[PDB]
Amino acid sequence: DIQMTQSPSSLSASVGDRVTITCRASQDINNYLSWYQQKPGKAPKPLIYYASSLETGVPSRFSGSRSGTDYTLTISSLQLEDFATYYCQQYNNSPYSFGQGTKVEIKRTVAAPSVFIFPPSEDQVKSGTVSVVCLLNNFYPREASVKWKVDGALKTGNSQESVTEQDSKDNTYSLSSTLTLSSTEYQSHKVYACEVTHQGLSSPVTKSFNRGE
Amino acid sequence: QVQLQESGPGLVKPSETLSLTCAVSGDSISSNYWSWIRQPPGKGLEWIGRFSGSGGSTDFNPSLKSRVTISTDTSKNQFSLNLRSVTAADTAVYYCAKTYSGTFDYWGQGVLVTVSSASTKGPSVFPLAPESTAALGCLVKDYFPEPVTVSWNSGSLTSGVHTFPAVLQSSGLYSLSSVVTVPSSSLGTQTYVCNVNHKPSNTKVDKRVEIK
């Protein structure tokens, strides 16, 4: 019955910032509220129990408080290790229910991507389907534009992009753009290029190869 | 320092029964409380059910109560989850957890379960080969279901490695690339091998990445 509404859904903050996450229960939960920290690919980790009690070993910069039916998790000074998705959870009554989560990502200085293009191997050409991979490495912010050019002409139909999570060290992102073509289509053109525009680049950078060379 | 470990099929056909087991090390399931929790990919957490080790009583989420069953084996210190009539809405990472009161104090590592009628398929692996820094890669294509694990040089090469999240292609199969950046001066001295493991098909692929 009790529904937890967590706010906000996502956040971007710098190291040293003060961040507060709020969670609202649709009914009275009598301080029975837990906060969890979930790293990408990992199980959630309890941080706070009974609304304000810290789990053993949790840094003191984490704290929880209550004002009526509103519950807040506060990080006094955000640190690099604190990137994660945070969840509230009531256990006043069954069924136990969670908030939707709050993503937390760390702000850093602009960083230009290093760009690489990968020609398809002959083994791949032999398969009847070819993938051309363009790599954007260690950049920030996340927003980037990758253009595929074939014999100088822009191609916009056959590509998909994939982005990593923020790196735990340098807080950068990486991105792959993969252009998929049939082997016949691939063998009917010479120059394959990806053109990337990013806020860290003074001018657009394009990487290319010549098929069969 | 109790440890919990989920195990079960990573692929279940719709309408069948998903069965998972949680093996508990270091604690007796005869005390305290134990739960199942699930998390659909890219979504939040949902509590499934709990049993009381002391009295054997169970409690289930009303959104699943009719389809869910929990049994225990104190002899093996294991407990199980049975979820019948599964559909694609039941695709998720399932976790087991220990509770003292209401909080989930210890968690398993989680097991991804995909509900689909599509058959298991091992991956094809193709090398990605090309200044001061060079990039190498491996394209892991046309497998089902998730997950695959990729390492480089048997796991001894980790610095600069990026393994991207898989994308479901229009063919209904997954594809991803793993890349690593290395000094160009290393290209003539060091060999680079990507190691691919796909447990659902019991497939393992090692691919030497060479410059032609």
Coordinates of C-alpha atoms in Angstrom, one line a residue:
Chain A
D1 CA 0.0 0.0 0.0
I2 CA 2.6 2.6 1.1
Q3 CA 4.2 4.1 -2.0
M4 CA 7.6 5.9 -1.8
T5 CA 8.2 8.9 -4.0
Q6 CA 11.8 9.8 -4.2
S7 CA 13.1 13.2 -5.5
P8 CA 14.8 14.0 -7.6
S9 CA 15.3 11.2 -10.2
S10 CA 18.8 12.3 -11.2
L11 CA 21.5 14.7 -10.2
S12 CA 24.8 16.2 -11.2
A13 CA 27.1 17.6 -8.5
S14 CA 30.7 18.6 -8.0
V15 CA 33.2 17.3 -5.4
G16 CA 32.6 19.1 -2.2
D17 CA 29.0 19.9 -2.9
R18 CA 26.2 19.4 -0.5
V19 CA 23.5 17.2 -1.9
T20 CA 20.1 16.3 -0.4
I21 CA 17.8 13.6 -1.6
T22 CA 14.1 13.6 -0.4
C23 CA 11.7 10.7 -0.1
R24 CA 8.0 10.9 0.6
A25 CA 5.8 8.1 1.9
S26 CA 2.1 8.1 0.9
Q27 CA 1.3 7.1 4.6
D28 CA 2.9 7.4 8.0
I29 CA 5.9 5.0 8.3
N30 CA 7.0 6.0 11.9
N31 CA 10.7 6.4 11.2
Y32 CA 11.1 2.9 9.7
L33 CA 13.0 4.1 6.6
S34 CA 16.3 2.9 5.1
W35 CA 18.6 4.4 2.6
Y36 CA 20.7 2.3 0.2
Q37 CA 23.7 3.0 -2.1
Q38 CA 23.9 1.0 -5.3
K39 CA 27.0 1.1 -7.5
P40 CA 26.5 0.1 -11.2
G41 CA 26.5 -3.7 -11.4
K42 CA 26.5 -4.2 -7.6
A43 CA 23.9 -5.1 -5.0
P44 CA 22.5 -2.2 -3.0
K45 CA 24.3 -1.3 0.2
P46 CA 22.5 -0.1 3.3
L47 CA 23.7 3.3 4.6
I48 CA 21.0 4.5 7.1
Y49 CA 18.4 2.7 9.1
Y50 CA 15.5 3.9 11.2
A51 CA 15.5 7.2 9.2
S52 CA 18.6 8.7 10.9
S53 CA 20.8 5.9 12.3
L54 CA 24.1 5.2 10.3
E55 CA 25.0 1.7 9.4
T56 CA 28.4 0.6 10.8
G57 CA 31.3 1.9 8.8
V58 CA 29.3 4.5 6.9
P59 CA 31.1 7.9 6.6
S60 CA 29.8 10.7 8.8
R61 CA 29.2 12.9 5.8
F62 CA 26.0 10.8 5.2
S63 CA 23.0 11.7 7.4
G64 CA 19.3 11.3 7.4
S65 CA 16.5 13.4 8.9
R66 CA 12.7 13.6 9.0
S67 CA 10.1 16.4 8.9
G68 CA 6.7 14.9 9.3
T69 CA 6.1 12.5 6.4
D70 CA 9.2 13.8 4.5
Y71 CA 12.5 12.0 4.8
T72 CA 15.9 13.3 3.5
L73 CA 19.3 11.8 2.9
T74 CA 22.1 14.4 2.9
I75 CA 25.7 14.2 1.9
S76 CA 27.5 17.1 3.5
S77 CA 30.5 17.2 1.1
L78 CA 30.2 15.0 -2.0
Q79 CA 33.3 12.9 -2.6
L80 CA 34.5 11.0 -5.7
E81 CA 33.6 7.6 -4.2
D82 CA 30.0 8.7 -3.6
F83 CA 28.7 8.3 -7.2
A84 CA 25.8 5.8 -7.2
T85 CA 22.0 5.3 -7.4
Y86 CA 20.4 5.9 -4.0
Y87 CA 17.1 4.3 -2.8
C88 CA 14.8 4.8 0.1
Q89 CA 12.8 1.9 1.5
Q90 CA 10.0 1.8 4.1
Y91 CA 9.7 -1.2 6.4
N92 CA 6.8 0.0 8.7
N93 CA 4.4 -2.4 7.0
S94 CA 4.2 -5.1 4.4
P95 CA 4.6 -5.1 1.5
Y96 CA 8.0 -3.4 1.8
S97 CA 8.4 -0.7 -0.9
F98 CA 11.3 1.3 -2.4
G99 CA 11.6 4.7 -3.9
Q100 CA 12.4 4.9 -7.6
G101 CA 16.1 5.9 -7.0
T102 CA 18.3 8.8 -7.5
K103 CA 21.2 8.7 -9.8
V104 CA 24.3 10.5 -8.8
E105 CA 27.0 11.6 -11.1
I106 CA 30.1 13.7 -10.5
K107 CA 30.9 17.0 -12.4
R108 CA 34.4 17.5 -13.7
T109 CA 36.3 19.7 -16.2
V110 CA 35.6 19.4 -20.0
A111 CA 37.7 16.7 -21.6
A112 CA 38.0 16.1 -25.3
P113 CA 37.6 12.6 -26.7
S114 CA 40.3 10.6 -28.3
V115 CA 38.8 9.1 -31.5
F116 CA 39.6 5.7 -33.2
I117 CA 38.0 3.9 -36.1
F118 CA 38.2 0.1 -36.6
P119 CA 38.0 -1.4 -40.1
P120 CA 36.1 -4.7 -40.2
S121 CA 38.2 -7.8 -40.3
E122 CA 38.3 -10.1 -43.3
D123 CA 36.7 -12.7 -41.1
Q124 CA 33.8 -10.4 -40.5
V125 CA 33.5 -9.6 -44.2
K126 CA 33.3 -13.3 -44.9
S127 CA 30.1 -13.5 -42.6
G128 CA 28.0 -11.4 -45.0
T129 CA 27.4 -8.7 -42.4
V130 CA 30.0 -6.0 -41.4
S131 CA 30.3 -3.7 -38.4
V132 CA 32.4 -0.5 -38.5
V133 CA 33.2 0.7 -35.0
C134 CA 34.1 4.2 -34.0
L135 CA 35.4 4.8 -30.5
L136 CA 35.3 8.0 -28.4
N137 CA 37.5 7.6 -25.4
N138 CA 37.5 9.4 -22.0
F139 CA 35.5 12.5 -22.6
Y140 CA 33.3 14.8 -20.6
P141 CA 30.5 15.9 -20.7
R142 CA 28.5 12.9 -21.8
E143 CA 26.9 14.8 -24.7
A144 CA 28.6 14.1 -28.1
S145 CA 27.7 13.8 -31.7
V146 CA 29.1 11.1 -34.0
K147 CA 28.5 11.4 -37.8
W148 CA 29.2 8.5 -40.2
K149 CA 30.4 9.5 -43.7
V150 CA 30.7 7.0 -46.5
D151 CA 32.6 8.3 -49.6
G152 CA 32.1 11.7 -48.0
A153 CA 28.3 11.3 -47.9
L154 CA 26.5 11.4 -44.6
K155 CA 24.8 8.0 -43.6
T156 CA 22.1 8.1 -41.0
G157 CA 20.3 4.8 -41.0
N158 CA 22.4 1.9 -39.8
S159 CA 24.2 2.9 -36.6
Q160 CA 23.8 2.4 -32.8
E161 CA 25.6 4.0 -29.9
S162 CA 26.6 2.7 -26.5
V163 CA 28.1 4.6 -23.6
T164 CA 29.9 3.4 -20.5
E165 CA 29.1 4.5 -17.0
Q166 CA 31.2 7.3 -15.6
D167 CA 34.7 6.2 -14.8
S168 CA 35.5 5.8 -11.1
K169 CA 38.9 7.5 -11.5
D170 CA 38.9 10.3 -14.0
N171 CA 35.0 10.6 -14.1
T172 CA 35.1 10.5 -17.9
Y173 CA 32.8 8.7 -20.3
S174 CA 33.5 6.5 -23.3
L175 CA 31.3 5.9 -26.3
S176 CA 31.1 3.4 -29.2
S177 CA 29.2 4.0 -32.5
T178 CA 28.8 0.9 -34.7
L179 CA 27.7 1.1 -38.3
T180 CA 26.3 -2.2 -39.6
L181 CA 26.2 -3.0 -43.3
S182 CA 25.7 -6.0 -45.5
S183 CA 28.9 -7.2 -47.1
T184 CA 27.6 -6.2 -50.5
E185 CA 26.8 -2.7 -49.4
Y186 CA 30.2 -2.4 -47.6
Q187 CA 32.1 -3.5 -50.7
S188 CA 30.4 -0.8 -52.9
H189 CA 32.2 2.1 -51.2
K190 CA 35.8 3.1 -50.5
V191 CA 36.1 5.7 -47.7
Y192 CA 34.5 5.1 -44.3
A193 CA 34.8 7.9 -41.7
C194 CA 33.3 8.9 -38.4
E195 CA 33.1 12.6 -37.6
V196 CA 32.8 13.6 -34.0
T197 CA 31.9 17.0 -32.5
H198 CA 32.3 17.6 -28.8
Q199 CA 32.5 20.6 -26.5
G200 CA 36.2 19.9 -25.8
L201 CA 37.2 20.0 -29.5
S202 CA 38.3 23.2 -31.2
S203 CA 37.4 21.7 -34.5
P204 CA 35.7 18.5 -35.6
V205 CA 37.9 15.4 -35.8
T206 CA 37.3 12.7 -38.4
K207 CA 39.0 9.3 -38.5
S208 CA 38.8 7.2 -41.7
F209 CA 40.1 4.1 -43.5
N210 CA 39.9 3.0 -47.1
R211 CA 38.2 -0.4 -47.6
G212 CA 40.6 -2.9 -49.2
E213 CA 43.7 -0.8 -48.5
Chain B
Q1 CA 30.1 -11.5 7.2
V2 CA 27.4 -13.9 6.1
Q3 CA 27.5 -14.6 2.4
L4 CA 24.5 -15.2 0.2
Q5 CA 24.6 -16.7 -3.4
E6 CA 21.8 -16.9 -5.8
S7 CA 21.7 -19.7 -8.4
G8 CA 19.4 -20.7 -11.2
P9 CA 18.6 -20.7 -14.9
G10 CA 19.5 -17.6 -16.7
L11 CA 16.9 -18.2 -19.4
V12 CA 13.3 -19.3 -18.7
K13 CA 10.5 -19.8 -21.3
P14 CA 7.3 -17.9 -20.8
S15 CA 4.5 -19.6 -18.9
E16 CA 7.1 -21.9 -17.2
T17 CA 8.2 -21.8 -13.6
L18 CA 11.3 -19.8 -12.6
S19 CA 13.1 -21.5 -9.7
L20 CA 16.1 -19.9 -7.9
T21 CA 18.1 -21.1 -4.9
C22 CA 19.9 -19.0 -2.4
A23 CA 22.8 -20.7 -0.6
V24 CA 23.7 -19.1 2.7
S25 CA 27.2 -19.4 4.2
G26 CA 28.0 -18.4 7.8
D27 CA 24.5 -18.1 9.2
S28 CA 21.6 -20.5 9.9
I29 CA 18.4 -19.8 8.0
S30 CA 16.6 -21.0 11.1
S31 CA 16.8 -17.5 12.7
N32 CA 16.0 -14.0 11.5
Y33 CA 14.3 -13.2 8.2
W34 CA 15.2 -13.9 4.6
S35 CA 13.8 -12.2 1.4
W36 CA 13.8 -12.2 -2.4
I37 CA 14.1 -8.9 -4.2
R38 CA 14.3 -8.2 -8.0
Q39 CA 15.4 -5.4 -10.2
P40 CA 14.5 -5.2 -13.9
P41 CA 17.3 -3.9 -16.1
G42 CA 17.6 -0.2 -15.8
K43 CA 14.7 -0.1 -13.3
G44 CA 14.1 0.1 -9.6
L45 CA 13.8 -2.5 -6.8
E46 CA 10.7 -4.6 -6.0
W47 CA 10.3 -6.8 -2.8
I48 CA 9.0 -10.2 -3.7
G49 CA 8.6 -12.1 -0.4
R50 CA 10.1 -13.1 2.9
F51 CA 10.0 -16.1 5.3
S52 CA 10.7 -16.2 9.0
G53 CA 13.4 -18.7 9.9
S54 CA 12.0 -19.0 13.4
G55 CA 8.4 -19.9 12.7
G56 CA 8.5 -20.8 9.0
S57 CA 5.8 -18.2 8.2
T58 CA 6.0 -16.5 4.8
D59 CA 4.8 -13.1 3.5
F60 CA 4.5 -12.1 -0.2
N61 CA 4.1 -8.9 -2.2
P62 CA 0.4 -8.8 -3.3
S63 CA 1.5 -7.9 -6.8
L64 CA 3.0 -11.4 -7.0
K65 CA 1.4 -13.3 -4.1
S66 CA -0.6 -15.7 -6.3
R67 CA 2.5 -16.7 -8.4
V68 CA 5.2 -17.0 -5.7
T69 CA 6.2 -19.8 -3.4
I70 CA 9.2 -20.1 -1.0
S71 CA 10.6 -23.3 0.4
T72 CA 13.5 -23.9 2.7
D73 CA 16.0 -26.7 3.3
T74 CA 17.7 -26.3 6.7
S75 CA 19.8 -29.4 5.9
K76 CA 21.6 -27.5 3.1
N77 CA 21.1 -24.0 4.7
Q78 CA 19.3 -23.1 1.4
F79 CA 16.0 -21.5 0.5
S80 CA 14.3 -21.2 -2.9
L81 CA 12.0 -19.0 -4.9
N82 CA 9.4 -20.4 -7.3
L83 CA 7.6 -18.0 -9.6
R84 CA 5.1 -19.5 -12.0
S85 CA 3.6 -18.4 -15.3
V86 CA 6.5 -16.0 -16.0
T87 CA 6.3 -13.4 -18.8
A88 CA 8.8 -10.8 -20.1
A89 CA 7.7 -8.6 -17.1
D90 CA 9.6 -11.0 -14.8
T91 CA 12.9 -10.5 -16.5
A92 CA 15.2 -9.1 -13.8
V93 CA 18.2 -9.5 -11.6
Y94 CA 16.9 -11.5 -8.6
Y95 CA 18.6 -11.0 -5.2
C96 CA 18.2 -12.8 -1.9
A97 CA 18.8 -11.0 1.3
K98 CA 19.0 -11.4 5.1
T99 CA 16.9 -9.1 7.4
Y100 CA 17.0 -8.6 11.1
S101 CA 14.0 -6.4 11.3
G102 CA 12.8 -4.7 8.1
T103 CA 15.9 -3.6 6.3
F104 CA 17.9 -5.7 3.8
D105 CA 21.2 -6.0 5.8
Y106 CA 23.1 -8.4 3.6
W107 CA 22.5 -9.1 -0.1
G108 CA 23.6 -11.8 -2.6
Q109 CA 25.4 -10.9 -5.8
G110 CA 22.2 -11.3 -7.9
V111 CA 21.3 -13.5 -10.8
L112 CA 20.0 -12.1 -14.1
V113 CA 17.0 -14.1 -15.4
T114 CA 15.7 -13.5 -18.9
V115 CA 12.2 -14.7 -19.9
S116 CA 12.0 -15.4 -23.6
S117 CA 11.2 -18.2 -26.0
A118 CA 14.3 -17.5 -28.1
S119 CA 17.1 -20.1 -28.0
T120 CA 20.5 -19.8 -26.5
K121 CA 23.2 -18.7 -28.9
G122 CA 26.9 -18.4 -28.4
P123 CA 28.8 -15.3 -29.6
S124 CA 30.9 -14.6 -32.6
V125 CA 34.1 -12.7 -31.7
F126 CA 35.9 -10.5 -34.3
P127 CA 39.1 -8.6 -33.6
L128 CA 39.1 -4.8 -33.9
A129 CA 42.5 -3.5 -35.0
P130 CA 43.8 -0.2 -36.4
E131 CA 50.5 8.1 -33.1
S132 CA 51.4 7.9 -29.4
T133 CA 48.3 5.9 -28.2
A134 CA 46.6 3.1 -30.1
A135 CA 43.3 1.4 -29.6
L136 CA 42.5 -2.3 -29.9
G137 CA 39.2 -4.1 -29.5
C138 CA 37.0 -7.1 -29.8
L139 CA 33.5 -7.2 -31.3
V140 CA 31.3 -9.7 -29.5
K141 CA 28.3 -10.3 -31.7
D142 CA 25.0 -12.2 -32.1
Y143 CA 24.6 -14.0 -28.7
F144 CA 21.6 -14.7 -26.5
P145 CA 20.9 -14.2 -23.7
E146 CA 22.8 -11.9 -21.5
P147 CA 25.4 -11.7 -19.9
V148 CA 28.8 -12.1 -21.5
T149 CA 32.1 -11.4 -19.6
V150 CA 35.1 -10.0 -21.4
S151 CA 38.7 -9.8 -20.1
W152 CA 42.0 -9.0 -21.7
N153 CA 45.2 -11.1 -21.4
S154 CA 43.4 -13.5 -19.0
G155 CA 42.5 -10.6 -16.8
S156 CA 46.0 -9.3 -16.3
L157 CA 45.2 -6.3 -18.6
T158 CA 42.7 -4.0 -16.9
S159 CA 44.0 -0.4 -17.2
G160 CA 42.3 1.5 -20.1
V161 CA 39.8 -1.3 -20.8
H162 CA 36.3 -0.3 -21.7
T163 CA 33.6 -3.0 -22.1
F164 CA 30.4 -1.4 -23.4
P165 CA 26.9 -2.4 -22.4
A166 CA 25.2 -4.7 -24.9
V167 CA 22.7 -3.5 -27.4
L168 CA 19.8 -5.7 -28.5
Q169 CA 20.0 -5.7 -32.3
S170 CA 17.0 -5.9 -34.7
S171 CA 18.0 -9.6 -35.2
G172 CA 17.0 -10.2 -31.6
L173 CA 20.6 -11.0 -30.6
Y174 CA 22.9 -9.0 -28.4
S175 CA 26.1 -7.2 -29.5
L176 CA 28.9 -5.3 -27.8
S177 CA 32.5 -4.2 -28.1
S178 CA 35.3 -4.2 -25.6
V179 CA 38.2 -1.8 -26.2
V180 CA 41.6 -1.0 -24.7
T181 CA 44.1 1.8 -25.3
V182 CA 47.8 1.0 -25.3
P183 CA 51.0 2.7 -26.3
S184 CA 51.8 2.3 -29.9
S185 CA 55.4 1.4 -28.9
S186 CA 53.8 -1.7 -27.2
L187 CA 52.2 -3.0 -30.4
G188 CA 55.3 -4.8 -31.5
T189 CA 56.3 -6.2 -28.2
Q190 CA 53.1 -7.1 -26.3
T191 CA 50.4 -9.6 -27.5
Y192 CA 46.8 -8.8 -26.8
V193 CA 44.1 -11.4 -26.4
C194 CA 40.4 -10.8 -25.6
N195 CA 38.8 -13.6 -23.6
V196 CA 35.0 -14.0 -23.9
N197 CA 32.9 -16.1 -21.6
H198 CA 29.2 -16.8 -22.3
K199 CA 27.9 -19.1 -19.5
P200 CA 24.4 -19.6 -20.9
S201 CA 25.9 -21.4 -23.9
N202 CA 28.9 -22.7 -22.0
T203 CA 31.1 -21.0 -24.6
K204 CA 34.5 -19.5 -24.2
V205 CA 36.4 -17.6 -26.9
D206 CA 39.9 -16.2 -26.9
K207 CA 40.8 -13.9 -29.8
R208 CA 44.2 -12.6 -30.6
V209 CA 44.1 -9.0 -31.8
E210 CA 46.7 -8.5 -34.5
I211 CA 47.9 -5.6 -36.7
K212 CA 48.2 -6.6 -40.3

